[PDB]
Design a binder for this molecule. Sequence first.
Ligand SMILES: COc1cc(CCCc2cc3sc(C(=O)CCC(=O)O)cc3cc2OC)c2cc(C(=O)CCC(=O)O)sc2c1
Lengths: 172, 172
Amino acid sequence: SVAHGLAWSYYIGYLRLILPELQARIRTYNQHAVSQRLYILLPLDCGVPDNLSMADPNIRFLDKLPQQTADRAGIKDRVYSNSIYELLENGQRAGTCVLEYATPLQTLFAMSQYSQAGFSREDRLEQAKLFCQTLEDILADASQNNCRLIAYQEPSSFSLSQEVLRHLRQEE
Amino acid sequence: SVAHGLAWSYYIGYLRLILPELQARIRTYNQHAVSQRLYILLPLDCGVPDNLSMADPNIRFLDKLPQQTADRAGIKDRVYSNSIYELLENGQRAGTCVLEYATPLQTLFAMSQYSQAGFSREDRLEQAKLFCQTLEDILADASQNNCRLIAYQEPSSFSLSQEVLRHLRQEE
Ligand SMILES: COc1cc(CCCc2cc3sc(C(=O)CCC(=O)O)cc3cc2OC)c2cc(C(=O)CCC(=O)O)sc2c1
């Protein structure tokens, strides 16, 4: 309901707008190597920290991609900013990619805390799963070649960098 | 459902982040007069053009506000851009304000066109109304002093600039 709408809104209002322009931005950054594809982190616990290096020190901020701008609903030159991270493994750089969390999962988290939202805290997991499955279904028929969904459930020793590396290595 | 979630997501993922910083950005622009408050256009027909001057020539782009940046879900310095418009009336500048459409209304429009979205085209109006009422209910208890909702239904001679001016003049 909320998850279904969030997945559609994230796709329509964000991914549909950045993904067609992403490959050219990465090619530009590389010519001035960062992997292609936006790697989207989908923690099913809906824990969305703003600083990726805090979630895993082995996920190290490298640089920002050149920004994309577009006139969007009266916002002239609405800016789309994306960050490049290096993934470390036993002190070695193992991968470089454009990475971010899916921000609707932070909305699901925050909504469950507001009494007026009518969203119970114990419904978070079911809604996160529906969000991930819906987004997967959208991207299958859309965008798909320009991004990779990294959905995961934390157990208490978990490596976020290893989770991303497993997806990055699958691309060969 | 989709409208309820969109209203909550627009508030949590956007308005909650820009509205506390808005007054300082407008004060800065004025000291270097633009009205305070973000004026949000809510067309119940869900018609969201990207260029405001196309919707009404009497709504003239003036300048961008200084951008706001924040680290957001792994996006370092995620940029929030907002545009300042002058409102004209019989060739006279009648008001100056930060104006944009609510982008979730463009999501409602686009969702109704995608077969996979399970959203019928004839449900748009009911969903737009629910989105506007929910956002109003959120802002009443939140942010409210930093923005003004301009919800309207087009009839076939309508002045968008006059609709905004009526709200702007109410602020005195
Ligand atoms: C219009 O519907 C959406 C929905 C999302 C999913 C997250 C929740 C949310 C985030 C944003 S961010 C936002 C704006 O920046 C306004 C202008 C614009 O839509 O581009 C509007 C909304 C509305 C939202 O819920 C409806 C989204 C996420 C976006 C991002 O820019 C990702 C990074 C971030 O969340 O700040 S644009 C965007 C647009």
